[PDB]
Design a protein around this nucleic acid. Structure first.
Length: 122
RNA sequence: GCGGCCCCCUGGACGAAGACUGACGCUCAGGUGCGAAAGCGUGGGGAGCAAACAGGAUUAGAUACCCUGGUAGUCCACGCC
RNA sequence: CGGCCGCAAGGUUAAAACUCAAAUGAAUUGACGGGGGCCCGCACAAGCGGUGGAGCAUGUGGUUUAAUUCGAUGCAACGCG
RNA sequence: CCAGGGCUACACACGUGCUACAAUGGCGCAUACAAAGAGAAGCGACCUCGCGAGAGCAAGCGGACCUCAUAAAGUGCGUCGUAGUCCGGAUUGGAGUCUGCAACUCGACUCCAUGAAGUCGGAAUCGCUAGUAAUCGUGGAUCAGAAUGCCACGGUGAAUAC
RNA sequence: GGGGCUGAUUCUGGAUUCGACGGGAUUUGCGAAACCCAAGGUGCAUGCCGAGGGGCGGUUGGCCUCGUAAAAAGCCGC
RNA sequence: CGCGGGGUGGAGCAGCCUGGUAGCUCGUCGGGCUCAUAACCCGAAGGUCGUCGGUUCAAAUCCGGCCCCCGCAACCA
RNA sequence: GGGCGUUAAGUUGCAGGGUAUAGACCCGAAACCCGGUGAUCUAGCCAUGGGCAGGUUGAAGGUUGGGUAACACUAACUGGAGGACCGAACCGACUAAUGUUGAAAAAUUAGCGGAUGACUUGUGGCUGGGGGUGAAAGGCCAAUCAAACCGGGAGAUAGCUGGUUCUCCCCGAAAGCUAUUUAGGUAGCGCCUCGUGAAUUCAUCUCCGGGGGUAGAGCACUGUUUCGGCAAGGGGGUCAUCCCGACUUACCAACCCGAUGCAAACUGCGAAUACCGGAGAAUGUUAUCACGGGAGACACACGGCGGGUGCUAACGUCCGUC
RNA sequence: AGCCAGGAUGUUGGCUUAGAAGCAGCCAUCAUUUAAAGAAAGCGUAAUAGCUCACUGGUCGAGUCGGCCUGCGCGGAAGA
RNA sequence: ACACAGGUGGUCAGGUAGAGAAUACCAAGGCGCUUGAGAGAACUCGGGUGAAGGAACUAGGCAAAAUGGUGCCGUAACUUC
RNA sequence: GUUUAUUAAAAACACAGCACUGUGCAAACACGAAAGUGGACGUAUACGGUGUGACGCCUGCCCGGUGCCGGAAGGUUAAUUGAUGGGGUUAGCGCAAGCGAAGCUCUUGAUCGAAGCCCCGGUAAACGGCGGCCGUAACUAUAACGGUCCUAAGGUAGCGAAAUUCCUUGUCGGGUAAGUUCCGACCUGCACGAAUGGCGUAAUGAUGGCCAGGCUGUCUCCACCCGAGACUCAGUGAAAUUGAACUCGCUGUGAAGAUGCAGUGUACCCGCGGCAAGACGGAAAGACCCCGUGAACCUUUACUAUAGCUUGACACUGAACAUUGAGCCUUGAUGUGUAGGAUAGGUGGGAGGCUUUGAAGUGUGGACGCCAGUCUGCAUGGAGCCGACCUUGAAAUACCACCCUUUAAUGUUUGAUGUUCUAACGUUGACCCGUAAUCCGGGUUGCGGACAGUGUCUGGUGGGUAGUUUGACUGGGGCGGUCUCCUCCUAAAGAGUAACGGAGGAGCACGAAGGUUGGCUAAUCCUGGUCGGACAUCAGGAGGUUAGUGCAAUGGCAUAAGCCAGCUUGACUGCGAGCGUGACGGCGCGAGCAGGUGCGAAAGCAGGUCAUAGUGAUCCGGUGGUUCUGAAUGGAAGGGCCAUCGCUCAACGGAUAAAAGGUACUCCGGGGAUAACAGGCUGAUACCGCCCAAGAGUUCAUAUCGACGGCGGUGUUUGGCACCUCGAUGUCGGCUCAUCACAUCCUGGGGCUGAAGUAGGUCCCAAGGGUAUGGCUGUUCGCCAUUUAAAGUGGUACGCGAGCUG
RNA sequence: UGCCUGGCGGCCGUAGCGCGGUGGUCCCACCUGACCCCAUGCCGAACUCAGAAGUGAAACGCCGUAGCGCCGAUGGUAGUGUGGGGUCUCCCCAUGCGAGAGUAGGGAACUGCCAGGCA
């Protein structure tokens, strides 16, 4: 099932805007993704420096016929242009915004992309 | 628990008078009998309604409330519970 | 559990360990209800003129920025300090 | 502490206001009737000058005296003739004016030219029950200057209530 | 022991994971590590020379200073 | 082979005999409605009407002709 | 020019050799089709007769008592039910032993199930072969049945197996290729035989004219493997910035050349053999070629040499050659 | 080759040495006196060890040592 | 196919014991079954008895051995009674 | 209860009960070409079919597939009908090229046309299916839960190591000394599960498994005894078999397991009773296995037909009427693209027809219709309206013509739908006569009634029935793979050359990627310089064909065969000396000759492409051309000739146009040409031993071990091969009875030990003798119990069935 | 006849490459000019036309030189036809044939027709 939304978020925060951002995966992570027993329970995105790294995303190393992978909950970066990135950061702190993982999947050109959005309303 | 009208059979209550029996009364473990609805058995019946079931919706879900359909059952006899 | 009753569903009879510092009855004051009743106020009506469209003045969110200083944010912030 | 800059940014969104979309109007002419308020590092007459904003001179008045001040709607004539118009004035060009050390960023005003959108406004929504609303001017405070804001003042003056 | 599937969702395509952070290349004006020279300022000046210093230590051979023999700087840690 | 019938937004389907509009939705975007949210409610991005040739004042549409799908009946040295 | 023809006598008997059509050299299937004969065994059904010693159990019902307000209830007795119980005849056939050229083509012996039933049995009837009947096993239909028996088509067909008879003499194979619903069959070629005809036709050797890419070798092309280094650059660690120094490091990154070995999809080389051609003598019963009559053969085996395959395993397997 | 002899000095050798004084260990393998004696040959002590060695004297008195090329043989060699 | 241990419906039914048409012995009746004689080995068939043990046999208690009648007493789970 | 007569009596069949379904009676259904008959002298409480199988509790989820039951707007569709078009003939006409009337004829195939199938809905006590992936719960684990795959749905209860469980003797518990079985549990159900029924169940059972008492010759372990044989005598008197025998053991050899061969050992001649190791002993032309273009039954969405059922047309086959669809005929309405006097069809005639044969313009009726407007009879009336008009791409309700739109109506044609009747036809209602008759016939009547039914034609359905097909190679067969073509290696220096040997490719492409004339010349590296890199283009040098060649590989290619331009069609027609290569069918190469061409000044080159793949015989037709033929003659059809088209006939020499399976119910001909057992050969594998000696062993390689590697022995395992046996060599285990080897389990002798003793380890010598009972399982074996000095390893057809067992 | 050079060939590395030196009267080359013939997939480079100021620089030719290429014995070795033999996966003997590589060494081409120039 390549393509899922975030059933943890609807009833917890509320989206304002929604951006799409390619992720810095490794390959095994991609495999685990092409599968589907990973969860956003607790995962959101954060800017450690000036760059945004979605964190707490757990991606079960591999299942069906798994094998040697890497740190299930690893700080994975996010891609987004300088302009498209200097924004959401300044609107985070507005008074209380949060970068929460909305949906995940691979695009036309076969690239796993993540969908984030501002959060409030809990 | 019992509602159309009619007849047949039948239990209790109540009143007016007087007469008769003369305490023959109260209660009652055990015992016996009755005991709604649902349910069961053997059959009958079967329009309405209706568990179940079928399907339509509603909903986040909706094995529900709503809607369309509908079996048992509701009715009869007898016997049970 | 045992007994007894029933074709069954089950009924009847009827405990103990264990556990809790309660359980319960009638009566509390409010607040609140997508509860009910009674009843008020330019809260809805009858009217007259507007805003919402336009250009502009001005404020704010936003966006941008080297900085766009801080504050004020339903009514009761936004020609507000 | 000081200079320069920003708070005035501008794809957009909203709030509150202003000005219109006009003959119950515009424009010229002439003529009518207020209130309230301010003033010395202030109001500043007259006179002259410039189209004008304004400037040169200069009385008066600490002020029922003097200045700010020549209310506007209105009334009378006159024209327009229902058009994106003589409606409407945004915008932009040029040339100027008073403030102030300093008007690029950003002041206000002036004169000449330019003459957007707008032909009365969806869902909706705000006001007001009387001298109110509507609509016309006037003044004050801040303030060197910078009022469509705010705070006042009177003129005209309705509709409507089961 | 043989058969199929699997190494990124576009079946021969053209580097669009737009993406960051990181790396490479080009340009530019500011800092001297962007840079070079010495006019530009000044007179005993110059350089190399040689030698020594804060409760303590280390580094700029350095920051300081002295001149035919002896006194004081900047950063970090305790 | 032949009789049909069919392709039109990112998928869905009307406009197909009538010529004269490129739309009806789902879904994103705003803007409406609330005291706010929901729910209804609107306006837009977006399609060579498959293709090309064509008559008309004008074509998705009537004509053409072919690529292409699907139904059938039939063909296969 | 080319193809086919003209430049060779045919014909009819007779004997023989082949082929064709026929049973076509003889014997042999399992089967297929046609017509009849069979239900005296067996399967089912129909009509009509028969059989079931002896013992058990004791259903429905009924009677009289008891008991009750009356029913309930109960008790004796009576009754005589049943794919009911034990057990002979009868019917079956579960186990074992014997028997197995039997006493017997399914039995004997000891045990075994049923035994008033969907029981069993006599006589007769009816159902017929792709048909019957079947409490279903493909069972039974006359010692049999996934299609009876008998006669016929009939000498079915048999690319299979077997067999094939008197004598002497001459020659003398093949177990290969090509095709094949072919693979143990067959066809054409090759090889045997007979005949006619034709050149020194053919073989061996000698001298002459040839092309080889094999054995071996080599590593230029090319390829692989191993070792060494290049100034430089570079990398790593070490004193820790940094000596932009030194050392060891082993480390590889950018195109470096050198040496050695090997060569199935390779050669900058290259034999022996073998083969093709010319010419020539000798020898050889034409050994050669063409035509024609008769074929057989197309399962090969081992051994040597050169190899693929396998284990340089096999009395393995697949080619070449003797 | 026997035999009779010697087999040492720094040095009990410094040493991550509990004890080493040759020895799994320590490192190097240098260094004194002699005829010549190894910071090491050994079976190997609680350690000093006792006892033989590689290496040197005497004795004896002529041969001795073991690589290469080749012949024939030997072990390696167990089945019903 | 045999002078074949097999198959073949009906009828008759004595005595003693016995429930009996079972079984045993007999009656009436009918039979010794068409090669005999000796021997007294293995082995085979069919039988009898067996110390101690008692399923150790075996695929398996196969085959044997065992129980065996009439009356009265007594008789568990379970049960469709 | 039934059943395999004659190896199976059972858990199979039957059963009462249950359910689904069909059947209205001339019933369905069955035997019958039919008549008839059964069903039944019955009548839905009846009768057939099918599944399930007392009773109890129950019987969940899925309708996509396949059946069946319905519906139906659409799509396609049979006989039939026979519209068009095209052809043959020839009266005539053209002097002639050709045309061609009527007729007759060949073809074409519109329109009509029912079921079917597609389609839509039901349906599971119809035939069936009841799965994957993922995610999710406090630690694990699982997953109540949620996604998903679209394949219709994903297992409810109950049960579960089972008559189902592969691993498996699962694990735990119980029973036993010990239990592969058993019982009770767990759930990890390879692969239970709800009328192909699930789970239970008292009774019953010559039913399967387990336990125990009693019993015992079943056994330790056999003894004695009575009887029938066996043995002797007498009489009678068989059998299968058999090339001939003067018919020994060993070891070897050998068509591979020897009485017969070699070598050798041993043995005087002949009976009798006994035993079964050999005579691959007898019996049956192996039943397994493979082969044959064998047979037969059986199956099915194999092929092809066919009875049955079903659809339509026509025939037997009626009289009256009504309504209505579709043509076709007149007639009369009918046209709101935009400027504009306005709900303009198109062309064409077309400057007056029309009106007193009574006009506008007022007034209604019927009327259509985007209620925009229009037409009309009636009528008042009472005497007119129109034309380029200037605009419109196109001008007149001025009107008239042949017409399309759409429309309406009488009519003609053709369909269908309905109603009323009767005479064919039916009657398996009634009554009458033949006739004392249940048949049949005729008659009368009632009931149906042109239906039903039957013939002919036709579409569908049709394992109910029938005939057949279902390849071959193969290191047996099957499974997989392969089948034609091309390149290379094997291939042994000419050609050719095999394998289920090692590697790759083809089933095309191109009107230029062909022809010619002229011209040009790659890769790779260095150096520089834009992005720009190890390689993008550019310069120079090196290099020198490594590049390139449409594509696999080999051979070629510079004179280029590589690359670019101009002109062009030689990608040409007829032929072809001569040669290659093939059994053949065929295939290839070819100078040159004639015609005509393109390029070139010209010599000259060109009959496709650097070459080698890129293919499909014949038959049967189709299309164009040629009078070659033409069944009396002239034509014509048809045939021939030349060009051409249609096969993944790919199993590629191509059995048919058309074809899959099962057999354990089987059968025949054959084969040891070819598998299973055993033998043989082999020895990779296995087992046994050795060589090296790092290391383990406190120190120390070799007491005991030993890495990495090396050499062997045996014949003994797993295999390879297919030599013997398929006109038969019986397979595992047990029993009984053995016999040999020694690589020795015990006992004996011994060396080393990391050997104190006791007890061990290891090696050497040794084959004399000895070398366990039991639980479980068919087991060999193994595990478990318990003994013993020990419980040896192997060979002997994995010894031993003419000895036993099964 | 000599020396030189251009053309066309034979031969096809003992002929080639490198490196040194060298030649311009003639020849050859570079070279000058280019509207024009003809030309560039751009370019007068090449192709071409008109020429002759310059130069032997490049190219070319000739001479020299053994750094590379090349040629390359003798002897041996390898293999192999026939015969024979072993300890037979591989060899040996007799006989014939006999490499490849390397060694010595060779080697800076040799040659015919025509033309031109100089002596």
């Amino acid at each position: 099932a390549p393509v899922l939304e975030n059933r943890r978020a609807r009833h917890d925060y509320e989206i304002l805007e929604t951006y799409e951002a390619g992720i810095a995966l490794k390959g095994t992570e991609v495999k685990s993704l092409r599968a589907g027993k990973v969860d956003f329970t607790g995962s959101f995105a954060r800017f450690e420096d000036g760059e945004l790294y979605l964190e707490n995303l757990y991606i079960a190393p591999y299942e069906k016929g798994s094998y040697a992978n890497v740190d299930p909950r690893r700080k994975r970066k996010l891609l987004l242009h300088k302009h498209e990135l200097r924004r959401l950061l300044g609107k985070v702190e507005q008074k209380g915004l949060t970068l929460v993982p909305l949906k995940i999947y691979f695009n036309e050109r076969g690239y796993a992309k993540v969908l984030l959005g501002l959060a409030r309303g809990k």
